[PDB]
Each structure stands twice: as structure tokens, then as C-alpha cells.
Design a protein around this ligand. Structure first.
Ligand SMILES: COc1cccc(OC)c1-c1cnnc(NCc2nc3cc(OCC(=O)O)ccc3s2)n1
Ligand SMILES: COc1cccc(OC)c1-c1cnnc(NCc2nc3cc(OCC(=O)O)ccc3s2)n1
Ligand SMILES: O=P(O)(O)OC[C@@H](O)[C@H]1O[C@@H](O)[C@@H](O)[C@@H](O)[C@@H]1O
Ligand SMILES: O=P(O)(O)OC[C@@H](O)[C@H]1O[C@@H](O)[C@@H](O)[C@@H](O)[C@@H]1O
Ligand SMILES: [Cl-]
Ligand SMILES: [Cl-]
Ligand SMILES: [K+]
Ligand SMILES: [K+]
Lengths: 308, 308
């Protein structure tokens, strides 16, 4: 893949819509058992914060050189404020609905001696009113972006994904979907869906060969009006199933240290590349190179254009 | 014990000096295992906050009808701000040194299905400068209180306890010490020390009888210039060892649900009573009645005057 001039990537406009998250990590020591319960006491010494979910997708898009808008819902709380701050220092243009009744989604990991003891989650469902308000922002934002990205984590932020996909594909805007759950009918009309092996199994069942997989993916795309499917297979790399044929990029990384934000980085890379008007085939290749860097990296991460 | 007119309790001035804490409780559900580690994911649904440590001691003093000042150190953070707020709504007169480099001590319990999975602690040592600043406040506050209470949790807030005890006993002010650790020489000159069975063992060793205990306590008080010792014995009640004789109050509560703030409530009750100019013997009795209520109570709690 030849270089795409930074001036060209800079004109790539990606609208990220989905479930925003704040990844928080508490590192501490465990020297004793609680006096109230047969459980450890963690004396926390340091904290670590990363943008998660759609936010990480969006920030991955800007580090490559592209532009990213973020349409999502947050609460009126400190994690929500932290996300705003982190979005600001990461060049992501925010478009945030605020639900005071909603807790900002935050994934808190607790660690000691370099292992997790627990994960603590705060999350809920945005109100009916708030979601319809975001849908209005979508109509306004849609003409201002070359490509739309749907980052789904089943947190409620994509309840109106179907209508959003229709509006965008009518506008000639390419639509990418990072899926969650098995009910995929909601994703119909998408230009590209990006599941991993586990996610695809719940929809179509276990394949018995590459042919069996190739056939199931083919059925899945016709019955769901989806143009292409990018299957991420970890150790087996990733395989694109488009109408113009297939493409397989073997896993370039040998050592894998942490797999958070892997999927985020992949779909973000393709989107930014597609927004820059580059071929889906090259977009898929670069997405896999990016995925191989992000894996050999602790916590949710990002890649620059040169690293590719 | 005959009632002490509320007008008399209202004139009881207690200076609480020590380690302030914020008890925080996260209640949630556990439906799955983390994708990163063989550990639970807690989806937290509700939070609970109580004043802890010296703060709980101080708030126990005001609910009985007495007055309480709180001399302590907090950080410049949200738990520190919460303590200020909770102190305000609980009538405790604050005297707080602020160390921005210090994390406010907060004890965070995580629960699901009504059991603890982990306790997360944030705490550190106040700076040399800050502690000496508090010592100055002590000299100013000392003439304004009838009795001083030292609530020790080995968090650094009582590094200058020895000098404080000297200053107070010179001023004719009664001094009470809720101990922590085994190095008790620092507590010398105190009017009353209030350990439980476990705390006393590390200092003097296991007794073989009441006589063996009576003898060890006697030695401990002469070698340490301490007037009286209040030993809290859980199921065995509590026994006062003063120079004017002994007093034993059997445990009045049969069901024990949570033991947090038990020790806090006991020493706080005695102090407020002593501040109101009531006999140590009656003070000890009422402290045990209060302890029997506070045990049949979830989390750190308080008692009113009538409940006694
Ligand atoms: C997530 O990636 C890995 C995961 C495990 C082992 C691996 O190689 C030994 C990889 C790996 C290493 N180097 N490159 C690649 N690229 C192909 C990809 N496979 C996946 C699989 C993904 O799903 C993660 C999940 O299961 O949630 C997400 C992104 C990619 S990207 N994968
Ligand atoms: C903490 O109190 C109990 C603890 C366990 C069983 C109990 O009775 C069956 C009691 C209990 C019940 N009713 N009254 C009393 N009063 C005597 C006291 N014993 C202790 C013991 C304490 O130490 C707690 C600790 O070990 O940290 C603190 C306060 C008191 S007050 N104690
Ligand atoms: O477990 P659920 O709630 O489905 O997802 C949240 C986490 O598992 C992580 O997901 C990863 O992909 C990342 O996006 C990361 O930011 C996030 O914390
Ligand atoms: O365990 P360490 O750090 O020594 O004490 C903190 C806790 O154990 C609890 O102590 C109890 O008495 C109470 O004062 C309560 O507020 C506090 O959280
Ligand atoms: Cl970040
Ligand atoms: Cl409180
Ligand atoms: K990573
Ligand atoms: K209690």
C-alpha cells in the first residue's frame, strides 16, 4: 500500500455514532483481608483513564490524520465531564446529548500485583426523549460527513440505528457497523459490518470449513441488504467478504498483550481510509496493520499514520 | 441512670482530633465474568455514603445533644468535599487542614447479592508542614472545649498526639484515646484509653483470668501515666478499670448485624457525657447502651439521646 498524502487524510470526515465509554483503571496493593468479609483490601496507589467505546473509535480516526465527529449520549457526572475533556485534547468534535438521569458509562478495572480482581460497571439506558433528540442531530450532522460509523455496545445509544442507516444510505453516505448481540436485522442496509468469530456464530452458527463460512456470509448479506462483511478472526487474521471478491490479511502481530480497543481501531481505520477515498481492500489491509500494533499495547490505544 | 437535661448536654464541648474517613458503599449485580480476567463484573445500581473515623465519632457526639469540633486533615478532592458537606448537615464544627498532595481517606465497599467482593482504599500520609499547622489549631481550639478525643486509625493525623495530650492535660482538659497499633507510649498521660480485646493483647499479651487481666491493666496504667482503661469485649460487654474501682456493663444487644462505628460510638458517648459533667461510671454505662443500638444497624450509625 502506497502512502496517502496527509493532506488527503485530513479531508476525511467520519461521523461516529454510538455508545461512549470511560475506561478507568485502579492500581493498588493487597496486604490484608477486610475485617468485614473474607475479601481483599486494595490500597490504590494510581489511576489510569482512557476513552472507551465510540470515543476510542473516534480518537483513533483523528490520530491517523482524519476528522471525526462524535454523536452520543453522556450523563451529567464526572466521568461524563472527563470524556468531554479527553475528547477535547484528542481533537474529536463532540456532539453530546446530556441525560442527567443517565450515569455515564464507565468501566472500572481494579488491579493489584498486575492482575485484575474485579471490574466495576456503571451504565444504564438513555431516555426516549434524549435518543430522539440525538436522531435530530444526526440529520444535521449527516451532510457534514463522508462516512458514518456505528459503534454498538448495546448500551442504548443505537436504538434508532435502523432509521439512521436508512437516512445515511439515502444520502449516499457509506455506513459501517461494529455489531453487538445477535439481532442484526436492525443493521440492514449497512455498507460494512465488522464482527469477530464469536459474534458471527450466534447469528449463523458454526461453520465446518471456509466454504461453509463463505456460504453463510453470502446468505447473511443478501438477507440483510449488507454489502460487505469484515470478519476479525484474531490469530487467523481477518477476511473481507465483498461483492467484488474476498480479501485476507493474516495477523501481523505475534505477541498479544491486551485486546481492548482492537475492534475499535479496525473499524475506525477502515472508516477514515474510506473517508479519504481509498479502496476498501487497502483500507482493510491498513486496518489489520493498525490492529497488530494496538494489541501489543496496554489498555485502549491508538496508532499514528506513520506507524502503519 | 437518671436523665441529663438536654440543656446540660448542649453545653458539652468535645474536641475530636484524628483520622477522618469517608465510608462509601457500591451495591450492584453480578451477571457475568470479565472478558479480560477470571473475575466478576459488578454492575453497580446504587451508592451509600457515611462519615467515617473521627468524623463519625464527632457526629455521634452531636446527635446525643452535645457539641463537637473536628480537628483533622483532608485532601483537595471529592471525598474531602463530601466530608465537608456531611459535616455541615450533621452540625459538626469543622477545623480542617487541606493537603492537596493528600488523598482524602475513603473506604469503598463493593457488594453484590448482599455480600462484599472487595474493599478499595485510598489513603496516605499528611505532610510534615500540614501536621504542624494542625497542631497550631489545637492550641487555639483547646480552651474552647471541655474534653479532647483522640480517634486514632494510624493514618498520620495523630503524629503529634503526645504533645497534644500534654498540652491538654496541662490545661486541665480530660483526654480520651481510641488506640491503634501497639506502640502506646505515645498515648501517655491520657485520662482514658479505649481498646478492644485484640488491641490490648498485642500490648500486654493474653491474660489467663480476670485477675491476670486486672493485673496487666494495672501495670499498663502506671507505666503509661494513664488514669483509666475502658476495655470493649464484644459478647463479654465492656469493663472499666479506673483508680476508683472497676465497672462492668454486659452486652445489651443480642443480635449483631454490623460492627462498624461501634468503637467510635462508645468513646464518643463517654466524651459527650464527660463534657456534660456526668460521672465516668454513668458515662460508661450509656456508652454501652449506645453500642448495643449501633451494632443492630447497617453501616456506620448514630444514636439519639432518647434511644439511650
Ligand atoms: C485481536 O487480535 C488478536 C487476538 C488474539 C491473537 C492475535 O494474534 C495472535 C490477534 C491479532 C494479532 N495481530 N493482528 C490481528 N489482526 C486480525 C484481528 N482479529 C481481531 C479480533 C477482534 O476481536 C476481539 C474480540 O474477540 O473481542 C478484534 C480485532 C481483531 S483484528 N490479530
Ligand atoms: C461490638 O459489639 C459486639 C460485637 C460482637 C458481639 C456483641 O454481642 C453479642 C457485641 C455487643 C453487643 N451489645 N453491646 C456490646 N457492648 C460492648 C462492646 N464491645 C465492643 C467491642 C468493640 O470492638 C470492635 C472490634 O473488635 O473492632 C467495639 C465496641 C464494643 S462495645 N457489644
Ligand atoms: O463489556 P462491555 O460492557 O460490552 O464493553 C466494555 C469493555 O468491555 C471494553 O470494550 C472494549 O472493546 C473497549 O471499547 C473498551 O473501551 C471497553 O471498556
Ligand atoms: O481498616 P481501617 O483502615 O483500619 O479502618 C477503616 C474501616 O475499617 C472502618 O473503621 C471503622 O471503625 C469505622 O470508623 C469506619 O468508618 C471505617 O471505614
Ligand atoms: Cl484518552
Ligand atoms: Cl453521614
Ligand atoms: K490494547
Ligand atoms: K453499625
Amino acid at each position: 500500500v502506497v502512502p496517502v498524502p496527509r493532506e488527503q487524510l485530513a479531508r476525511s470526515r467520519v461521523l461516529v455514532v454510538g455508545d461512549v465509554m470511560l475506561d478507568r483503571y485502579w492500581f493498588g496493593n493487597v496486604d490484608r483481608i477486610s475485617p468485614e468479609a473474607p475479601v481483599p483490601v486494595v490500597h490504590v496507589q494510581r489511576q489510569e483513564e482512557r476513552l472507551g467505546g465510540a470515543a476510542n473509535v473516534a480518537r483513533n480516526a483523528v490520530t491517523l490524520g482524519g476528522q471525526a465527529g462524535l454523536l452520543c449520549v453522556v450523563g451529567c457526572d464526572e466521568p461524563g465531564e472527563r470524556i468531554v475533556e479527553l475528547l477535547g485534547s484528542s481533537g474529536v468534535t463532540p456532539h453530546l446529548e446530556r441525560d442527567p438521569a443517565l450515569p455515564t458509562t464507565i468501566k472500572l478495572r481494579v488491579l493489584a500485583r498486575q492482575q485484575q480482581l474485579l471490574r466495576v460497571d456503571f451504565e444504564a439506558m438513555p431516555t426516549h426523549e434524549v435518543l430522539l433528540a440525538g436522531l435530530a442531530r444526526f440529520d444535521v450532522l449527516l451532510p457534514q460527513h463522508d462516512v458514518v460509523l456505528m459503534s454498538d455496545y448495546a448500551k442504548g445509544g443505537l436504538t434508532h440505528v435502523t432509521t439512521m442507516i436508512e437516512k445515511a444510505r439515502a444520502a449516499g453516505k457509506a455506513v459501517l457497523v461494529d455489531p453487538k448481540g445477535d439481532d442484526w436485522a436492525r443493521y440492514r442496509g449497512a455498507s460494512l459490518i465488522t464482527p469477530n468469530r464469536a459474534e458471527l456464530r450466534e447469528v449463523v452458527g458454526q461453520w465446518k470449513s471456509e466454504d461453509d463460512l463463505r456460504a453463510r456470509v453470502a446468505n447473511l448479506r443478501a438477507e440483510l441488504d449488507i454489502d460487505a462483511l469484515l470478519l476479525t478472526r484474531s490469530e487467523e487474521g481477518m477476511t473481507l467478504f465483498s461483492a467484488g471478491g474476498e480479501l485476507h490479511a493474516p495477523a501481523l502481530a505475534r505477541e498479544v498483550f491486551d485486546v481492548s480497543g482492537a475492534g475499535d481501531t479496525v473499524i475506525a481505520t477502515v472508516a477514515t481510509m474510506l473517508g479519504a477515498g481509498v479502496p476498501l481492500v487497502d483500507a482493510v489491509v491498513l486496518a489489520n496493520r493498525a490492529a497488530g500494533i494496538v494489541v501489543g499495547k496496554l489498555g485502549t490505544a491508538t496508532v499514528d499514520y506513520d506507524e502503519l
